[PDB]
């Protein structure tokens, strides 16, 4: 919880003390896994409906009499083995989400932040001010800060100008200090934070 | 999502049809009866894999019997004489090869006969 503080142009300052109860907790792998699975299922919307036998525009009459005919006994022309259709136990429109306890989700998010701390991909950027929404400026900022793969930036107050600029990258997205989740944190593999959001999330947790 | 019945049917049926070459007519081209042959072939294979021991033993035995009778000896008395001659760990296959090296078979037979009495 003693990560060094960095400036805009890659300059470094005195290190920042971090909350032990939030960032030094030994992570729980199973809890992090279940939290991943939780909103991973929650993102999908699951709209798929396939026409059951009773609603396939036809059927109705008996095609031929039961006995005295060389054909097999058979019901409506729309039937499961019948070619025209009528499927059985198809996908139905339904919800793929549930809920987890507050303690569990807070433990999970603490676990993943602390895991990021212990593998040292947290870089703290205090007072992230940019006077224009141009993209190549923060591109040069990130090249100076030496990040190559994906990343995530959290800044709470400067979001109105940063969000237009940084949304250009497909793999890089801003988030507010409120909206911290597990997929965005794990996937983006390099968490960019400001000290104001550090204290904000610190008091939230 | 929906899973279609893709290449798996072609692969599995082509495997057994490939394995079933040489069969008579429809049994080597139509799956419904080609498969019906191969479990029959598997059972016959296992049964005669265990039956090969006994009919080969019978072949060795009748060859040994001929070898004993043309030295004027019954096969049963031959093996009896061998057993009280000693622990004749020599067995039916290599006694059969002794028939194809018959002079050695003679050299065993007279030893068994002379030991017998």
């Amino acid at each position: 919880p003693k990560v060094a503080l960095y400036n805009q142009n890659g300059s470094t300052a005195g290190d920042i003390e971090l909350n032990a109860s939030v960032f030094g907790i030994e992570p729980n792998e199973s809890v992090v896994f279940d939290a991943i699975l939780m909103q991973r299922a929650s993102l999908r919307q699951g709209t798929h409906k396939v026409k059951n036998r009773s609603e396939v525009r036809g059927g109705g009459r008996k095609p031929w009499r039961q006995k005295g005919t060389g054909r097999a006994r058979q019901g409506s022309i729309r039937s499961p083995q019948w070619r025209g259709g009528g499927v059985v136990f198809g996908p139905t429109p339904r919800s793929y989400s549930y809920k987890l306890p507050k303690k569990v989700r807070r433990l999970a998010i603490k676990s993943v932040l602390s895991s990021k701390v212990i593998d040292n991909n947290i870089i703290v950027l205090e007072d992230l001010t940019l006077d224009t929404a141009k993209t190549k400026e923060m591109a040069a900022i990130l090249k100076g800060l030496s990040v190559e793969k994906k990343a995530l930036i959290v800044t709470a107050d400067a979001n109105e100008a940063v969000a237009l600029s940084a949304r250009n990258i497909p793999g890089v997205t801003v988030v507010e200090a409120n909206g911290i989740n597990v997929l965005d944190v794990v996937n983006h593999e390099k968490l960019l934070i400001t000290k104001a959001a550090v204290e904000k999330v610190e008091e939230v947790l | 999502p929906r899973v279609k019945g893709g290449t798996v049917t072609r692969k599995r049926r082509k495997k057994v049809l490939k394995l079933a070459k040489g069969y008579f007519g429809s049994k080597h081209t139509l799956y419904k009866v080609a498969n019906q042959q191969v479990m029959k072939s598997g059972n016959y294979a296992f049964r005669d894999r265990r039956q090969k021991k006994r009919d080969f033993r019978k072949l060795w035995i009748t060859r040994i019997n001929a070898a004993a009778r043309m030295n004027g000896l019954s096969y049963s008395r031959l093996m009896h004489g061998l057993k009280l001659s000693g622990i004749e760990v020599n067995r039916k296959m290599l006694a059969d090869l002794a028939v194809n090296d018959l002079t050695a078979f003679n050299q065993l037979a007279d030893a068994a006969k002379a030991q017998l009495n």
């Binding site: - | 479990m39 072939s41 598997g42 294979a45 296992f46 760990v89 067995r91 290599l94 050695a104 050299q107």
Partner: protein, 101 residues
């Protein structure tokens, strides 16, 4: 030519041939010997369970074999009983030198 009981079944063996027999504990490049020898052939010294001293059969082993697949299939009809099991039997390729009598 002599008779070597080897792996539970005696094989007739001559000087200079090669024989496929069951897989020993020796490695695939070092010569091995079979002690329990009988029916030395030629001048055919032969005793019941013979203690023919100095007649062990030196033999160089060059393979750690694994024989061809026999697909063993079982089924009992009208009963939906199936049992399929692949099988390879291990072996060793042995060449034979210095038959001793």
């Amino acid at each position: 030519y002599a008779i070597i009981k080897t792996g539970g079944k005696q094989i007739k063996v001559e000087e200079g041939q090669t024989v496929y027999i069951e897989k020993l504990a020796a490695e695939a490049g070092e010569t091995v010997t079979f002690e329990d020898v009988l029916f030395v052939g030629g001048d055919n010294v032969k005793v019941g369970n013979p203690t023919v001293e100095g007649a062990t059969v030196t033999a160089k082993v060059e393979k750690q074999g694994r024989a061809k697949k026999i697909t063993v299939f079982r089924y009992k009809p009208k009963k939906n009983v199936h049992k399929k099991q692949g099988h390879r039997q291990p072996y060793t390729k042995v060449t034979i030198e210095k038959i001793n009598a």
